[model samples]
Target: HMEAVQNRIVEAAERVPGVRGVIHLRARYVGQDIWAHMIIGVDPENTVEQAHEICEAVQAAVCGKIRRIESLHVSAEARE
Candidate 1:
């Protein structure tokens, strides 16, 4: 279940211009719903700023695809 969410979010985040992919993701149910923690790994040519943009886009995509999920936290990092 969590992997599915991760993939969806990764796919969406990867659509952002400078994002290479997802470096890591952690998903769990905090209470009645789900909470997601993800890192947006950016391309080597890109930077943290672009990675942040990917995070925003990823969150929006996740929320759009899975409305039941109520909490989302995104982080940004450049791929080494």
Candidate 2:
């Protein structure tokens, strides 16, 4: 089911140490493609480089673990 798969994706993102929290996450399956839009929280003090790296890590973690993900839009936010 989509719920289970989305949960797995969230799990993957949360596993990364720099990921403060998952703010907004949603996914949809159209035809044979699965795409996701995710907004994750990071340290407010984090440098731009650090935030970018965290975003990359989240993307890699999700894509590497979850198969058949056509696209994932990961955005970073600083929220306590």
Candidate 3:
């Protein structure tokens, strides 16, 4: 199930042509054992709008995979 969810996310990212570089996926338990952070990133094109769109797509993909998830905190920018 996890793999299916992850694959869906990757597919979503790939759908956006402006997405560049690599996609990083991570997950870990928090202090009391809660899902801490799930992040996805790409080296992205030059514009903030482009990056923002990619991030939005990623968020949507994640939400689709995990319907119970309410909100997401996303940061999409050029890797410096």
Candidate 4:
């Protein structure tokens, strides 16, 4: 079940708008604090505002779907 939850988180984030790719995804529970980290790809032409908006949306989407998440950190980068 541990590995399954991680995959679910990735899938949830990938469904968000403006997400070109999801990489370096990590999710685990440290005692009772469940945290996640992921890097998302976006269009290279996107403005800073647009990219950050996508990042925020990814965080919200994942947390909204997975209530056990206590912390989630999402990074955005230009797609290669």
Q: Per-residue error at 1 for model 1, in Å?
A: 4.4
Per-residue lDDT of model 1, residues 1-80, tens digit only:
66776667667667766666777777787665778787877666765666667678778877887766788888877676
Pairs in steric clash, model 2: none
TM-score to true structure, per model = 0.72, 0.94, 0.50, 0.92
> Which parts of model 4 are misplaced by more than 4 Å?
none
Task: Say which prediction, candidate 1 or candidate 2, comes out ahead on lDDT.
Answer: 2
| Model 1 / residue 2 / CA error / Å | 4.0
Stronger candidate by TM-score (3 vs 4):
4
List the candidate numbers ranked by TM-score, top first. 2, 4, 1, 3
**What digit string (tens of lDDT, one per residue) describes model 3 on residues 1-80?**
45665455556555555555334654332442223133445564456776777777767766666554455455554553
lDDT of each prediction vs. the true structure? 0.73, 0.90, 0.53, 0.89
Displacement of residue 5 (Cα, Å) in model 1 is: 3.8
For model 4, how big is the CA root-mean-square deviation? 1.1
User: On a 0 to 100 scale, what is the lDDT of residue 2 in model 3?
Assistant: 54
Q: Which candidate tops lDDT? A: 2
Residues 2-79, model 4: lDDT tens digits: 687787888998999999989778778977667888999999999989999999999999999988889999999999
1-80 in candidate 2: lDDT tens per residue? 78888889888999997898899998999777789999999999999899989999999999999887989999999977
Candidate order by lDDT, decreasing, is 2, 4, 1, 3
| Superior by TM-score: candidate 1 or candidate 2 | 2
